Amino acid sequence: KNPKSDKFKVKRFHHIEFWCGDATNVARRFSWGLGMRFSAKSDLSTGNMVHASYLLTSGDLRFLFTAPYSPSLSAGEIKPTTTASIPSFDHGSCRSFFSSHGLGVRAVAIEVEDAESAFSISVANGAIPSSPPIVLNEAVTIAEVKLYGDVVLRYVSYKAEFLPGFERVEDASSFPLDYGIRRLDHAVGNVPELGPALTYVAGFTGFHQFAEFESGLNSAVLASNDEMVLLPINEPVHGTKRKSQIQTYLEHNEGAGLQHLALMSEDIFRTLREMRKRSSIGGFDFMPSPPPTYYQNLKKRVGDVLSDDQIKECEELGILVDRDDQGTLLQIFTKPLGDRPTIFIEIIQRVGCMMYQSGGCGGFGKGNFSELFKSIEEYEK
Amino acid sequence: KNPKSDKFKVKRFHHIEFWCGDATNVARRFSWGLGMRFSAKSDLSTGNMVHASYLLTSGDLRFLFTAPYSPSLSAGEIKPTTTASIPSFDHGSCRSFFSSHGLGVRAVAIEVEDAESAFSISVANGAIPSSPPIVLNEAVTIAEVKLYGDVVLRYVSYKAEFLPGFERVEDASSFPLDYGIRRLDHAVGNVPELGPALTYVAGFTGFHQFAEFESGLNSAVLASNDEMVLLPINEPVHGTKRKSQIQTYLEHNEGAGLQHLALMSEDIFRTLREMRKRSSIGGFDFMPSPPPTYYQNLKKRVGDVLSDDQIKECEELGILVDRDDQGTLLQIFTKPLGDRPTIFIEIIQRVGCMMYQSGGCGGFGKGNFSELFKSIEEYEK
Ligand SMILES: Cn1nnnc1NC(=O)c1ccc(C(F)(F)F)cc1S(C)(=O)=O
Ligand SMILES: Cn1nnnc1NC(=O)c1ccc(C(F)(F)F)cc1S(C)(=O)=O
Ligand SMILES: [Co+2]
Ligand SMILES: [Co+2]
């Protein structure tokens, strides 16, 4: 069921912001690794004495990378006189985030009809405020509330190009890479206790539990009215033979934070071919492929959705497949994006549920846990 | 003249270590940008709970990238029980370095006959000690003294693979990139006062002033006995019409530090072709090309060293050329490697002074200051 209880008008995922120590190197590695173009900048060359911020785009997917300059550059400024293009930025908060968590996501940004109302209603409804609504050049309004750990849910709204004060990146610098990635499908947090995290977040958003379908985790998914903003949350299961990777996340991240970003591709086979070509030359590595038993059992499961050629192409690329009662899902996971075993990326493509495609079509790969266990067990013999 | 006054036996540049917030992303960007192979690692996968360190190699050039993990991972260790492969590493020192300087060089490492003696004689001769000599697995000895700002001169010596505790990187991960870079030619520091910096460093090394040949800087070059270890130092000139870029460095870096690394290529034309192909797809950008007047005046200067074809190839790639009384030098400079206008890279190739090639053959490009001024002046009209 879908009660459509959003307490304010939510549109779509707008951008994801990584807090970094050096934004240039992370941005350039991600661009090559994922096929995302440099499309806007806010830094010293644009008058910003506070932070360096570089935006990568692919389709509607926006990855923002931000790092602080030396505070001495802006020591004479005050908030009314700031040159920061993102007024919520804070040198100390940023350095503290990165030294506590390493490279990771600071802001999950969703676009809303009215960022001030969304902020006001949110905190009226239990949200811990993080940065009050601020109106940028009479054009854009931005506001932030705590989501979990040191991650904020950021609201953005436009009266009528990324943000004021950002400049388009010169086209000679902007090389039009594209490996097929098109938008953010879901952004997933890890926490020590699912219950209170769910209660808090659904409490101030009105997001409902997305209706779905013993190793690892327990999860639940929060979704907006049209279920295009999807915010799953995991917690660890303690005691198992294999140590919970959610617990490993919490230890290495120093607590709760964003675990994985799932990026929708319009052609997962082209995306995975292009990213795998670059794994060893600056891009991203992928988790170990499932054993061939897994693909031998795929025909009995999605033989009506994927031809024998498409299923063997899954085998080369290491793609996983799962299926709801309404759609089929193709998915694969990268290795951690940085030094720590914390944040990683998921590539997905959804087939089915056309009316546009409805959100979550196929679920999130729930069936692939038992299928992978049964496959390792079958293959071993 | 060359007094050969080294106070201890110095061999060659051994490696350069960057202190980072995330070593994975910097390392992967540098590898693609410069054509350096992943050759060794020390991290969680090798038992190191303290720091992540990744080594890139090209020829004899070794670039080490290191970042701290969460201190909680090693909270039960003490120095005798440490899992750090580089015993001089310190979480607080590293986080402080990166938050004060951003991405940059922490250690210039030279190999010496005996690292304990080199340390002892150095501090006996005025060197501020930074990390005392430590013997790694009865095989390698490492010691560190302050060089300038927060940069250390690191001594390494072997009784008889990078360091103990590092593992060779699996060849599937190791893609054999190579754009022709072969070794470190010189490593250059920026300081506010040349005099005391020279006095201190030459004081404890015995390095002599390398004998050489109004906009910017004043410099001098320190060299070892055979002049293969070259450590130039700059200071700003205040008052000029154009603000000294040494002063800009000092302000943005929060003080003294390593300004540029000069990497020797065995074929600067192949190197610059390969790096320029990648500038906009994750690699490095280059400083703006000199005006064509500069290349029109090149025939009158190195017409006997470079054919008309080689000089026009310089024009495409933006290469600078200079000439001593013994050799010719080809050089070009990258844009800053990271967010701040601080550290950058120089690519060079030296032609002449064969007996092997003697160090510094051609100088360091002194003549290119007046030649560039005269070129901008000539071209303008
Ligand atoms: C619940 N949820 N919400 N958003 N995403 C998710 N689940 C996943 O994406 C997911 C799906 C399948 C697997 C499996 F079985 F292949 F290992 C692992 C994950 S995993 C550990 O979490 O990455
Ligand atoms: C003295 N020294 N020691 N080691 N390296 C050096 N000099 C250089 O490499 C050098 C050489 C020529 C130019 C010029 F004229 F093209 F701008 C700029 C530099 S620069 C600012 O310093 O990068
Ligand atoms: Co997922
Ligand atoms: Co130089």
Instruction: Please identify which residue in the block is written with the tokens 């405020």.
Output: A129
Q: What is the spatial distance between Cα B67 and Cα B41, in angstroms, rounded to a whole number?
A: 12
Report which residue type is found at B86. Answer: I
Q: What is the spatial distance between Cα B330 and Cα B368, in angstroms, rounded to a whole number?
A: 11
Task: Give CA separation, A150 vs A23, A128, B72, B95, in Å.
Answer: 19, 12, 18, 19
CB A240 within 8 A of CB A248: no
Sequence length of chain A is: 381
Pocket lining: B153 vs ligand 2, CB cutoff 6 Å = no
Q: Is the dihedral of CA A196, A199, A203, A209 positive or negative?
A: positive
CB A157 within 8 A of CB A114: yes
The ligand placed nearest to the CA atom of residue B233 is 2
Cα(A261) to centroid(ligand 1), Å:
11
Q: Which residues of B are annotated as a binding site?
A: 186, 260, 346
How far away is chain B from the Cα of A301, in angstroms, using its nearest Cα? 32
Query: In chain B, where do the E strands start and end?
Result: 10-19, 37-42, 51-58, 61-68, 104-112, 129-136, 140-148, 151-158, 167-168, 181-190, 208-209, 217-223, 230-236, 257-265, 320-323, 327-333, 344-352
Question: Do B103 and A25 make contact, defined as CB atoms within 8 angstroms?
Answer: yes
Q: What is the spatial distance between Cα A86 and Cα A131, in angstroms, rounded to a whole number?
A: 11
Count CB atoms within 10 A of the CB of residue A153.
25
Q: Which residues of B touch A38 (CB under 8 A)?
A: 280
Exposed e or buried b per residue across B116-150, where buried means at least 16 C-beta atoms within 10 angstroms of its C-beta: bbbbbbbbeeebeebbebbbbeeebbbbbbbbbbb
Q: What is the spatial distance between Cα B227 and Cα B209, in angstroms, rounded to a whole number?
A: 10
Exposed e or buried b per residue across A344-366, where buried means at least 16 C-beta atoms within 10 angstroms of its C-beta: bbbbbbbbbbeeeeebbbbbbbe
| Of residues B43, B173, B341, nearest to A280 (C-beta) | B173
Q: What is the spatial distance between Cα B201 and Cα B205, in angstroms, rounded to a whole number?
A: 6
- How many Cβ contacts (< 8 angstroms) between chains A and B? 130
A260 is in an annotated binding site: yes
Q: What is the DSSP annotation of A32-57?
A: HHHT-EEEEEESGGGT-SSEEEEEEE
Task: Give CA separation, B64 vs A120, A219, B247, in Å.
Answer: 49, 40, 27
How far away is chain A from the Cα of B298, in angstroms, using its nearest Cα? 28
Pocket lining: B318 vs ligand 2, CB cutoff 6 Å = no
> For the range B305-312, what are the long-range contacts, defined as Cβ-Cβ under 8 Å and sequence gap of 24 or more?
B305/B351, B310/B269
Instruction: Classify residue A172 by burial, with Cβ atoms within 10 Å: 0-12, 13-18, 19+.
Output: exposed
Q: Which residues of A touch B76 (CB under 8 A)?
A: none
Q: What is the spatial distance between Cα B154 and Cα B144, in angstroms, rounded to a whole number?
A: 4
How far away is chain A from the Cα of B253, in angstroms, using its nearest Cα? 8
Output the CA angle B264-B266-B271, nearest 5 degrees: 80
Q: Which residues of B touch A100 (CB under 8 A)?
A: 70
Could you tell me the two tokens for A141?
């309004």
Q: Strand, coil or helix: what is B72?
A: helix
Q: Where are the domains of chain B?
A: 1-178, 179-381
Phi then psi for residue A18, to 5 deg, are -85, 135
Q: What is the spatial distance between Cα A207 and Cα A229, in angstroms, rounded to a whole number?
A: 9
A346 is in an annotated binding site: yes
Residue B336 CA from chain centroid, whole number:
13
Pocket lining: B232 vs ligand 2, CB cutoff 6 Å = yes
Report which residue type is found at A70. Answer: S
Exposed e or buried b per residue across A81-95, where buried means at least 16 C-beta atoms within 10 angstroms of its C-beta: eebbbbbbbbbebbb
List all residues 6 or more positions away from A303 whose beta carbon is below 8 Å from its beta carbon: A311
Question: Do B339 and A280 make contact, defined as CB atoms within 8 angstroms?
Answer: no
Q: Strand, coil or helix: what is B25?
A: helix
CB A347 within 8 A of CB A265: yes
Sequence length of chain B is: 381
Q: What is the spatial distance between Cα B108 and Cα B151, in angstroms, rounded to a whole number?
A: 7
List all residues 6 or more positions away from B347 whose beta carbon is below 8 Å from its beta carbon: B181, B262, B263, B265, B268, B271, B272, B275, B331, B332, B334
| Of residues B72, B172, B339, nearest to A24 (C-beta) | B339
Roughly what angle, to the nearest 10 degrees, separates helices B268-278 and B23-34?
A: 130
Report which residue type is found at A312. Answer: K
CB B233 within 8 A of CB B198: yes
Pocket lining: B237 vs ligand 2, CB cutoff 6 Å = no
CB B34 within 8 A of CB B181: yes
The ligand placed nearest to the CA atom of residue A249 is 1
Structure's resolution in angstroms: 2.2
